[PDB]
From Swiss-Prot, chains A, B:
EC number annotated for this UniProt entry: 2.4.1.339
GO molecular function, one term: glycosyltransferase activity
Activity dependence on pH, as recorded: Optimum pH is 7.0 for phosphorolytic activity. Optimum pH is 6.0 for the synthetic reaction.
UniProt protein name: Beta-1,2-mannobiose phosphorylase
Keyword terms, alphabetized: Glycosyltransferase, Transferase
One protein family per Pfam: Glyco_hydro_130
Residues the entry annotates as binding beta-D-Manp-(1->2)-beta-D-Manp-(1->2)-D-Manp: N31, R46, R89, E140, D141, K188, Y273, D333
UniProt xrefs under Gene3D superfamilies: Glycosyl hydrolase domain, family 43 (2.115.10.20)
Species this protein is from: Listeria innocua serovar 6a (strain ATCC BAA-680 / CLIP 11262)
SUPFAM superfamilies: Arabinanase/levansucrase/invertase
Function: Catalyzes the reversible phosphorolysis of 1,2-beta-oligomannan. In phosphorolytic reactions, prefers beta-1,2-mannobiose (beta-1,2-Man2) as substrate, but can also use beta-1,2-mannotriose.
Family of this protein: Belongs to the glycosyl hydrolase 130 family.
Record field: catalytic activity: beta-D-mannopyranosyl-(1->2)-D-mannopyranose + phosphate = alpha-D-mannose 1-phosphate + D-mannose
Assembly description: Homodimer.
């Protein structure tokens, strides 16, 4: 691929963003959902804030109390032999290193808008902030699918009940309608297809499985974009490849003449994240036609390789302008970057590989 | 309360059922779904067959290969230092004790029918046998909800992709229609409510969660009993109590003047299973009104205590006859038993506790 990485990269960094919580630091502004509205590019940024502990032997978990509608910080000692603090994103029990007891930060969604796609201005206030008992550890990684005049904004809802995926709909980014947890825990990386397809709506999703099964992309159909069923396995991990550890939905499916083009992320077990592509049948998106054998975007620039969680590119949306895709991606779980690519080149790579 | 355990218990044992796979033994006929059809009680038995190995140092896992439509057997040495065989239901990686690599048996569904509710006769052939790539490790624990003339038969579908819940509909138990995986993995113990409730159908379900969340009962709504949404947390585990390790739905919700009566199973962390009860609001079954503090049925008969996996009662369905519930339950993951209880007495226990 001939990727054009934007000269202004990284576009938006934690320095650009002031914390909304007293005594917290912004540790990322990343993984932003992408929409066009009223002549501007909107990035629905995930902003992660972490409390600063006065004592460096203590870390705090920033948990939202749904009954009181405020944070209630929970403290943990670094030397507590019950807990493992080696993954900077979470507090883990040593007996459950496959999961977490708490996250180290709390996320919410805040919009940034651009007229030229390159220079962004933040909206004054947050857009979505934890509002119920399914979001007590944060709202994360908001995706946006526009169908007609309606924007479907769906996001990870993290709490003690699990990691679910929930939906808000809106025609203007001001008047919001909550549509509930559209996928049960454990799920995330939900991408709603941008039109009805032979009588059904579809969404990619990504169950995380305790007993058996890998971290694989699934698809579901829907009559109404509120209820989903007919769940099917779609894209699996591949041992020895860039997506040996996990795969998940990235950008919204892109209609091409050759099929639905899926720009998904893949990671190894070492947690290096890249973007790959797949192509699904136009008329029945449950059928996979081609998949890349090498990535379309990987961490190579310094901003991609270095940050809060290094060696990550994580694209949550893109805007098509003919053959050109303006892709926006989180980098290193820290900042937002932008690049342009050609859809025809992605298709070509699919064909070749 | 007082429980009328049938004099004929256990009603159906592995001794009553011949294996359909050469070189296998029936290890359980259990956890049967319950329906009334054409003047008879139908039990949709889970029949688990285990491949027998003449070498005691070796065990075998039965896998249905969805391409050849044939059983393949995977062998293991019991002294393999990478696997754990201590749970007789499963073959586990020592690095993943919270899950499984294989099961020790393969299940399918076979109908038994009765005129009197006590004496049963097996149908000649199986009813549902693994038929797709979601069912390679078996079809388990069929629940049946009858709405008008249509029987909704929904069951665990176990494979290398995860443990999903799938649905077949029928008006006659002869012509079957497959409706897909109505719940994505990891889920099971799905109980469809027996009527439309203020404009929506409902089902109990039970996400199993890798990262965070306990093994808790959830609820979802649906427009058509094919797709489900608006997932909500319903009944959680209680540390220190009979349901400290997990809860899941048992029988189909029973309409009472006081609300939807839910006969659920609970287990401790030591895997002792009992039945409990809860009461949901009649008009909004997302609201829990009452729950038992002590069980309504425990494993105390010899056939409940001793067998393939001892100290289990697991009721998957009941027939209502006025105030009497004729409840049928798996015992020790081995056999089927029946008892009669009274709806009014369970409601009374709910009120008292
Ligand atoms: O950190 C890489 C990548 O990992 C996943 O999210 C992680 C973290 O951000 C999140 O807070 C928790 C809980 O949902 O799950 C971690 O696995 C991605 O979904 C993405 O958000 C991260 O960029
Ligand atoms: O064994 C008790 C109880 O446990 C659950 O099922 C177990 C087993 O039968 C099943 O084969 C695997 C895979 O689905 O999960 C085990 O946990 C219950 O659902 C029930 O079937 C058993 O009676």
């Amino acid at each position: 691929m001939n990727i054009y990485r934007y000269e202004e990269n990284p576009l938006i960094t934690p320095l650009d963003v002031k914390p909304i919580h007293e005594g917290f630091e912004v540790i990322g502004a990343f993984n932003g959902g992408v929409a066009e509205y009223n002549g501007e590019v909107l990035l629905l940024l995930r902003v992660a804030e972490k409390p600063v502990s006065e004592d460096p032997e203590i870390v705090l978990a920033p948990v939202y109390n749904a009954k009181n509608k405020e944070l209630e910080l929970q403290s943990f000692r670094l030397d507590d032999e019950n807990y493992d603090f080696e993954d900077p994103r979470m507090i883990r029990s040593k007996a459950k290193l496959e999961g977490f007891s708490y996250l180290t930060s709390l996320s919410y969604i805040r919009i940034a808008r651009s007229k030229d796609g390159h220079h962004f201005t933040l909206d004054e206030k947050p857009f979505l902030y934890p509002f119920n008992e399914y979001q007590t550890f944060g709202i994360e990684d908001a995706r946006v699918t526009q169908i007609g005049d309606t924007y479907h904004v769906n996001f990870s809802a993290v709490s003690e009940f699990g990691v679910a995926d929930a939906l808000v709909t809106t025609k203007d980014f001001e008047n919001l309608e909550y549509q509930g947890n559209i996928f049960a825990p454990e799920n995330k990386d939900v991408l709603i297809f941008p039109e009805k397809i032979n009588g059904k709506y579809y969404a990619l999703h990504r169950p995380s499985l305790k007993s058996i099964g890998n971290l694989d992309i699934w698809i579901a159909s829907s009559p109404d974009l509120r209820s989903f069923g007919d769940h099917r396995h779609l894209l699996g991990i591949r041992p020895g490849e860039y997506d040996s550890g996990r795969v998940g939905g990235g950008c919204v499916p892109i209609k091409t003449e050759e099929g639905w083009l899926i720009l998904y992320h893949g990671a190894t077990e070492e947690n290096r994240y890249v973007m790959g592509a797949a192509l699904l049948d136009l008329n029945d998106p449950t059928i996979v036609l081609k998949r890349t054998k090498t990535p379309i975007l990987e961490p190579v620039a310094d901003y991609e390789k270095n940050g809060f969680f290094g060696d990550v590119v994580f694209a949550c949306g893109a805007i098509q302008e003919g053959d050109t895709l303006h892709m926006y991606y989180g980098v290193a779980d820290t900042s937002m970057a932008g690049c342009d690519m050609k859809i025809s080149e992605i298709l070509h790579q699919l064909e070749v590989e």
